[PDB]
Amino acid sequence: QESCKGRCTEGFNVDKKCQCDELCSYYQSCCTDYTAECKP
Amino acid sequence: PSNCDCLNGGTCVSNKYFSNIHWCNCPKKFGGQHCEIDKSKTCYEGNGHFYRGKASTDTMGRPCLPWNSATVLQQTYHAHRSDALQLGLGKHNYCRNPDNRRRPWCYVQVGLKPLVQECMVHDCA
Amino acid sequence: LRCMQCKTNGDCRVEECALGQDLCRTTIVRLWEEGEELELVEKSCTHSEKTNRTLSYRTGLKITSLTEVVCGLDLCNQGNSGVTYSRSRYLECISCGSSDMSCERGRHQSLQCRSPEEQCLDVVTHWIQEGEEGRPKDDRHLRGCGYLPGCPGSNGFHNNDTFHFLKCCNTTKCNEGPILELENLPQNGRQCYSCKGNSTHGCSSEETFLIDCRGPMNQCLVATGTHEPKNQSYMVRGCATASMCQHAHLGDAFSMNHIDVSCCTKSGCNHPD
Ligand SMILES: *[C@H]1O[C@H](CO)[C@@H](O[C@@H]2O[C@H](CO)[C@@H](O[C@H]3O[C@H](CO)[C@@H](O)[C@H](O)[C@@H]3O)[C@H](O)[C@H]2NC(C)=O)[C@H](O)[C@H]1NC(C)=O
Ligand SMILES: *[C@@H]1O[C@H](CO)[C@@H](O)[C@H](O)[C@H]1NC(C)=O
Ligand SMILES: *[C@@H]1O[C@H](CO)[C@@H](O)[C@H](O)[C@H]1NC(C)=O
């Protein structure tokens, strides 16, 4: 399961699909709702 | 004294390990290859000729054609054009008014031959 | 050999890929800053002893990512970079750089690499002062993720007015610690001669004098090669690592091509004779 609404600010989760951390766009790994969920 | 075409107090940088490609080191509300872009701004000062910053859409909501695209490359105003930096015309589709229309505008694909269109932007009045 | 010639402003054309020289290359710089980002791409001819390489580092809120790829076919820089290529994050290193002094003021940061081949790097690039009218605009300290030419382990050269150094290591955070300053590493015992410039005025007997090598740079070295805006003949003498006396690692340092590097052990063995 993906989705960044889940907490949205834990950090990098090495066993997890999309990421919700501050560098996800760098690593090109965000959830498509990152921007929305925690960055409105 | 200065170097590279960095604008807005950009600081130039290069790297010996990479064919000395050079590029700007920009402060704060400026980005773009040359700190050319006032990523802060949301309206234009009278006329718009000196408006930089983003905004990519005309009145109808239609998105601007990029100043470096092949179609735009056929018009009078495009990014491959010497004065291009001084006119705010680059590798982006941000609104500009390099030819002193009443306001900021851009090329927009309506029909074949694309049309110049007054652009989605507010006057700071 | 023909290549794609492309300025960052994106204007392109085809060049009959220069004379003697024969690789085309693409170089990409990705400037990344919280959400937003920007990509500069350059393409052109280049000389043969260039290769595939990365370097990536954090300055404050931002990361920069250099990368340059190399092929050798009448048009092959042609086409786009290279879903998901970052399916993961790999080695963790310290990173900072001189452009915001993050390096100099110990504001170092964790940075994870984007590929399984990248190692942690500390590069030093120091210049006394002028040559053209200001000289290269390399950050003086840069550290981060990368794979640079002739890497595993280390290399360095210094002389009267320059100092360059690459640490490059495959272990976790093996690039951390205080930033080297040369005037700061031990004298190793060797003395070597030092100059830049031409064999006559630049590197003449009267202009070449000894210096005390430091750190692991404990071979005396002589390099001759051909400089950019294609002014031939450039010579350089100094203290180096054996690593430097192997391969054209001095090439990229001194913006030089087609280069011979003699080297030796006994102090002073370095003179134009
Ligand atoms: C060794 O290297 C020296 C590096 O400077 C070189 O010095 C001078 O280099 C300049 C290069 O520009 C020459 O002037 C030429 O440049 C302009 C274009 O910018 C031309 O318009 C001029 O007509 C001229 O061709 C100087 O001739 C040259 N003179 C000096 C100071 O020596 C040396 O000449 C080089 N000698 C060796 C070892 O090969
Ligand atoms: C790196 O060089 C090799 C040849 O050794 C080539 O196969 C590769 O495509 C180059 N760069 C990348 C990452 O594609
Ligand atoms: C990294 O390179 C190879 C990986 O197999 C290895 O032989 C070498 O010893 C490694 N370096 C160390 C010891 O960290």
Q: What is chain B written as a DSSP string?
A: ---TT--TT-EEEE-TTTTT-EEEE--TTEESTTS-EESS--EE-TTSTT--S---BBTTSPBPPPTTSTTGGGSS--SSSGGGGTTT-SSS---B-TT--SS-EEEE-SSSS-EEEEBS-EE--
Ligand nearest to the CA of C233: 1
Residues C166 and C269: their CA atoms lie apart, in Å, by: 25
Contact B5, B34 (CB under 8 A): yes
What domain range is C141 assigned to? 86-185
User: Beta-carbon neighbour count of residue C270 at 10 Å?
Assistant: 27
Report yes or no: C32 at the A interface, CB cutoff 8 Å: yes
Contact C136, B16 (CB under 8 A): yes
Question: Are C80 and C26 contained in the same domain?
Answer: yes
Contact check, Cβ <8 Å, C25/B16: no
Q: Which residue has the tokens 């990014």?
A: B79
Q: Is C150 left (phi over 0), alpha (psi -120 to 50) or beta?
A: left
Q: How far does the CA of residue C150 sit from the closest CA of chain A (Å)?
A: 26
Say how many Å lie between the CA of residue C54 and the centre of ligand 3. Answer: 19
Contact check, Cβ <8 Å, C136/B14: yes
Q: How many domains does chain A have?
A: 1
With 0-12 CB in 10 A as exposed, 13-18 as middle and 19+ as buried, what is C39? middle
Ligand nearest to the CA of C173: 3
Q: How many domains does chain C have?
A: 3
| 3-state secondary structure (DSSP) of residue C263 | strand
Q: Provide the resolution (angstroms).
A: 2.8
Contact B15, C55 (CB under 8 A): yes
Nearest CA in chain C to B2: C134
Structure tokens at C210: 């000894």
* Domain spans, chain B: 1-42, 43-125
Say how many Å lie between the CA of residue C231 and the centre of ligand 1. Answer: 9
Structure tokens at C71: 């092929």
Give backbone dihedrals phi and psi of C47, rounded to 5 degrees, phi first. Answer: -80, 165
What domain range is A9 assigned to? 1-40
Residues C154 and C140: their CA atoms lie apart, in Å, by: 17
The Cα diameter of chain B in Å comes to: 49
Of A22, A27, A35, the CB nearest to C86: A27
Of the residues C66, C85, C104, the one at which a domain ends: C85
Residues B108 and B114: their CA atoms lie apart, in Å, by: 5
Structure tokens at C154: 């280390």
Say how many Å lie between the CA of residue C201 and the centre of ligand 1. Answer: 11
Give backbone dihedrals phi and psi of B44, rounded to 5 degrees, phi first. Answer: -120, 145
Q: Which residues in chain A are closer than 8 Å to C113, comparing Cβ atoms?
A: none
Query: Residue C192's beta-bridge partner residues?
Result: C211
Cα–Cα distances in angstroms (integers) from residue C146 to residues C15, C64, C158, C269, C270, in the given order: 30, 11, 23, 35, 33
Three-state SS string across C163-176, please?
EEEEEEECCCCCCC
Could you tell me the CATH number of the domain that includes residue C145?
2.10.60.10
Q: How far does the CA of residue B94 sit from the closest CA of chain C (Å)?
A: 14
- CB hemisphere CA count around C7 (13 angstroms): 9
Of the residues C85, C101, C125, the one at which a domain ends: C85
Is it the case that chain A and chain B have 3 or more CB pairs lying under 8 Å apart?
no
Contact C227, C254 (CB under 8 A): yes
Q: Which residue has the tokens 């100099």?
A: C104
Nearest CA in chain C to B31: C38
CATH architecture, domain B1-42: Ribbon (2.10)
Cα–Cα distances in angstroms (integers) from residue C16 to residues C3, C13, C76, C239, in the given order: 7, 10, 13, 39
Note the CATH number of domain B43-125.
2.40.20.10
Contact B3, C135 (CB under 8 A): no
Element (H, E) at C206: none
Residue from B14, B18, B78 to probe the interface with C (highest C Cβ count within 10 Å): B18
Contact C86, C114 (CB under 8 A): yes
Structure tokens at C239: 């203290």
Structure tokens at C112: 């994870």
Closest-CA residue to B85 (of B29, B7, B26): B7
Residues C183 and A15: their CA atoms lie apart, in Å, by: 46
Element (H, E) at C224: strand C219-227
Structure tokens at C144: 């981060």
What Rg value do the Cα atoms of chain B yield, rounded? 15
- DSSP letter for each residue of C66-90: EEEEEE-SSS-S-S-----S-SS--
Experimental technique of record: X-ray
Residues B79 and B83: their CA atoms lie apart, in Å, by: 9
Residues C142 and C145: their CA atoms lie apart, in Å, by: 10
Structure tokens at B31: 């980005």
Question: Are C46 and C95 contained in the same domain?
Answer: no
Residues C149 and C152: their CA atoms lie apart, in Å, by: 9
- Cβ-based neighbours of B42, under 8 Å, separated by 6 or more: B53, B55, B121, B122
Structure tokens at C214: 């430091």
User: Beta-carbon neighbour count of residue C259 at 10 Å?
Assistant: 18
**Chain-centre distance of CA C153, in angstroms?**
15
Residues B19 and C47: their CA atoms lie apart, in Å, by: 10
Structure tokens at C269: 């063995």
Which residue type sits at C51?
A: T
Residue of the CA atom closest to atom 37 of ligand 1: C198
Length of chain B: 125
Contact C221, C237 (CB under 8 A): yes
Structure tokens at C86: 């970052």
What Rg value do the Cα atoms of chain A yield, rounded? 9
Q: Which residues in chain C are closer than 8 Å to B11, comparing Cβ atoms?
A: 99
Question: Are C81 and C119 contained in the same domain?
Answer: no
Say how many Å lie between the CA of residue C200 and the centre of ligand 1. Answer: 12
B interface with C, Cβ–Cβ < 8 A, is 3-4, 11-23, 25, 31-33, 39, 68, 79-80, 84, 90-91
Element (H, E) at C93: strand C92-97
Output the ligand 2 site: residues, CB below 6 A: C 52, 69
Residues B7 and C240: their CA atoms lie apart, in Å, by: 39
Contact B104, B118 (CB under 8 A): yes
Q: Which residues in chain C are closer than 8 Å to A25, comparing Cβ atoms?
A: 32, 35, 37
Contact B12, B22 (CB under 8 A): yes
Question: Are C131 and C94 contained in the same domain?
Answer: yes
Of the residues C85, C104, C135, the one at which a domain ends: C85
Structure tokens at A39: 């960055």
Give backbone dihedrals phi and psi of A36, rounded to 5 degrees, phi first. Answer: -65, -70
Element (H, E) at A25: helix A24-27
Contact C222, C270 (CB under 8 A): yes
